[PDB]
């Protein structure tokens, strides 16, 4: 369908001793497929999906070398940023970086992105044109001028529109049994007599993939937002996701309420209602 490849990098400085803690994770859609952890014993980029394990030693060597170079760049950046923001050498600070590409249903390039944050705030990001930079403040403006001088956006655009897309298509092909399979939500409704004259109806969506889903309640065919609670979509831990939406209703009026589920895995939206015998 529509697909994405994204890499996430986090470095956290350790002022007391040694290098920053560095964690890198790679995703295809909502599936983690590679990781690097500076605290792990291997010091190698490691596979996290069965379809990436078929890649040869040249692949793992290359990914390890690049990810280690990312770690060193973030180590130097943490020092640079401490200087730009006139901060002490005693505190712990964080740099985060995310980049990746999206392809449409025809597996052609849709968009690319490259964003960087310092202490959890936007620092500098590549604009959607893949040619220019958004600098959030004057420290990031200094970086923007350096990156303009070093042809950074050209090299990123070449990777995001070329390499990133070409490898994403390879991964989608190699991992087709899972990456291209949609897992429609397994739905059910629960009923919880919550007070004296009311009951909570909870509409569950389980074991679904990808994570994107919409759960909405209706009362007599009209959207109900009052007395509703929607939890954030959460990982089941087996690669699938879960979500629930609840509404508090007067007892005896349950049949007026319907839960509607929309997901990529459902050719027609699903409607659930509480049956009074259960």
């Amino acid at each position: 369908g529509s697909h994405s490849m994204r890499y996430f990098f986090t470095s956290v400085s350790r002022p007391g001793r040694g290098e920053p803690r560095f964690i890198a994770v790679g995703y295809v859609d909502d599936t983690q497929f590679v990781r690097f952890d500076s605290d792990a014993a291997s010091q190698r980029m490691e596979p996290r999906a069965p379809w990436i394990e078929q890649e040869g030693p040249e692949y793992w060597d290359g990914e390890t070398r690049k990810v280690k170079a990312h770690s060193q760049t973030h180590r130097v950046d943490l020092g640079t940023l401490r200087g730009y923001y006139n901060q002490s050498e005693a505190g712990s600070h964080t740099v985060q970086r995310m980049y990746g590409c999206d392809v449409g249903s025809d597996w052609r390039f849709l968009r690319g992105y490259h964003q960087y944050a310092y202490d959890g705030k936007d620092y500098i990001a590549l604009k959607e044109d893949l040619r220019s930079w958004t600098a959030a403040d004057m420290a990031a403006q200094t970086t923007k001028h350096k990156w303009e001088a070093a042809h950074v956006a050209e090299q990123l655009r070449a990777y995001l529109e070329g390499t990133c897309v070409e490898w994403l298509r390879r991964y989608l092909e190699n991992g087709k049994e899972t990456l291209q399979r949609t897992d429609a939500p397994k739905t059910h409704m629960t009923h919880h007599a919550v007070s004296d004259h009311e009951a909570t109806l909870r509409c569950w969506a389980l074991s679904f993939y990808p994570a994107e889903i919409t759960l909405t309640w209706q009362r007599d065919g009209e959207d109900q937002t009052q007395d509703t609670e929607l939890v954030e979509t959460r990982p089941a831990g087996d690669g699938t996701f879960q979500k629930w939406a609840a509404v508090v209703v007067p007892s005896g009026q349950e049949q007026r309420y319907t839960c509607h589920v929309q997901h990529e895995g459902l050719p027609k939206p699903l409607t659930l209602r509480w049956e009074p015998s259960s």
Partner: peptide, 9 residues
Amino acid sequence: VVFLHVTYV
């Protein structure tokens, strides 16, 4: 595959 040219801020 990850990007090859990350540059200093």
